[PDB]
Symmetry: C2
Subunit: 333 residues, 2 copies
Amino acid sequence: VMKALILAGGSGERFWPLSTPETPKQFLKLFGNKSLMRWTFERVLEEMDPKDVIVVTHKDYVERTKKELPELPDENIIAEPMKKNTAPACFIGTKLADDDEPVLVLPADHRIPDTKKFWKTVKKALDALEKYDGLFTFGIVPTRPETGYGYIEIGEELEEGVHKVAQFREKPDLETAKKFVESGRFLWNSGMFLWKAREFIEEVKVCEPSIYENLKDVDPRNFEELKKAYEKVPSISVDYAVMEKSKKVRVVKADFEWSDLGNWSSVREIEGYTEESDEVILVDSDRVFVKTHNKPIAVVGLSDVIVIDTPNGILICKEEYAQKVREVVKKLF
Amino acid sequence: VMKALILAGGSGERFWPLSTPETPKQFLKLFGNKSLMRWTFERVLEEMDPKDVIVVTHKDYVERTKKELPELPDENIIAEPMKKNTAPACFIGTKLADDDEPVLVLPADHRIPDTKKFWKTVKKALDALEKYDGLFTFGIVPTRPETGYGYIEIGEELEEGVHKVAQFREKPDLETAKKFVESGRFLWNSGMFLWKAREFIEEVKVCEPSIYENLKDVDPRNFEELKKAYEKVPSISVDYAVMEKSKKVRVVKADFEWSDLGNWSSVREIEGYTEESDEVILVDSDRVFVKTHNKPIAVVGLSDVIVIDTPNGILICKEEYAQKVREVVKKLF
């Protein structure tokens, strides 16, 4: 018995001009002519019947989620009355589970190309969960001194590849980041989780009563009932809400390619820089990421720049400012 | 009793994506829905009869020239068999005047907004020509430092605003223009010339026979004959051919504002950097020049760039590399 909980609340904001307010990150077909969420759903379906998968997302997103995931029973989609981040989503998704049922929590907007190593790692976490209880996160083995991700400090070892979490650390300085990688004592917080339903519910009661009392006996499908609760409930990631507080947090080492797809630079990391070609002309310009639409694009005198041309517009972004594409969406709409 | 010779040739390559690849610069409509040549023809018509205006241009553009300039008599367009730069075109155009007629030679792809001051200057230049003879140039006081213009060293003062030319200088290093602009002994060569038909003819015999001996007996309007004579005749500017070598070059301080429209930067210099607007979004980006087309353009984390969007393409160009747009066109086909 196992439940999968897909959290799908993102913003394509950093993916303008490809993303539109009407199309959040989760529906973007960045790879292979399928959305991030679809890939994620298919990843899960490798080892699970869809009866045990749950999507927690806004109502605006619900209908297109049905057309994206025809296999998913309409009941298993769970409409949210407002964006209050992952912690409340996690909570209402977890209540569908039975007390001693494992709940695997997954963002809809990440990329994990090896579906088998993913399940190898999840099986390992399931076995560990049964041996030690507590709340489990997945730490990705860093392959570069990445400043864009948050980190998990390895603690005491229970078993090979399963550790207590000594500490969480947010985006570090490049030197600090380089020390984290060289050390081998830090992992990337993948944003993925695994816990037994009952244990998480109880853990929130101490960490964030705010969340527990208001959602305690609210039926998550009853749209109206959940609105009042949500009006009462704060905005706060479960990372901040529970994980940063509990004394029973473990990490499982994940040996697989993973990305949060944070911004356009993240896509470049996966794809590599763009090749000079008949639609991309480069003169004294290196390390450029260019997605063309229907006309040639020439970049002259500029290095480390992202250029995206879609019908919604054209973006031209120095690479390190790829997080500030959000501001474009703020100013534009 | 005075001829105007308009030289109509020049690559418009540096105005990609506006210009097609072999598009002649003189037909670009950079300002007010009128071509550079049209503006130039109108400027001369302020004081002149079309019968005294000669356009020297490649055969391919004769018909299109007629259409820009319908006031111009069909016989006043002289069809060249090959592109051979300005010295040979100056020659065959200047042959059409009487020996003692003044001939004002003007580039077709410059921008002189103040027509009245243009003619103020010319009339001063005509009066000087009558007193002193020689080949006259028009010097522009450097309002800026900029490399790769022509350069005229101010020599002996013949009379106020009329000097001999100590030296003709066709190129410079960066910030050597600083000790030309702050030295005050150097004017930009505006590319306009004034001479009596016969003196210039004599001077081509002395400065470079190659052109003179091959073209002296030839009638400019007999295409075949001109086609035969041009095979023997070199491609060389009148600057390198005559001005740089001649011992009778005078200079006149120019009383109007002027620009050579060398590249996209020149257009920025005239229009200004671009205003953040409905279709131009600027995050952490200063001193950008942006011509949108059908969609919004966001420029994030980048300064001193030119972004031009047209059906033919998109150009993103660091401002100081604006000459290198030539390299783009080469790569494009």
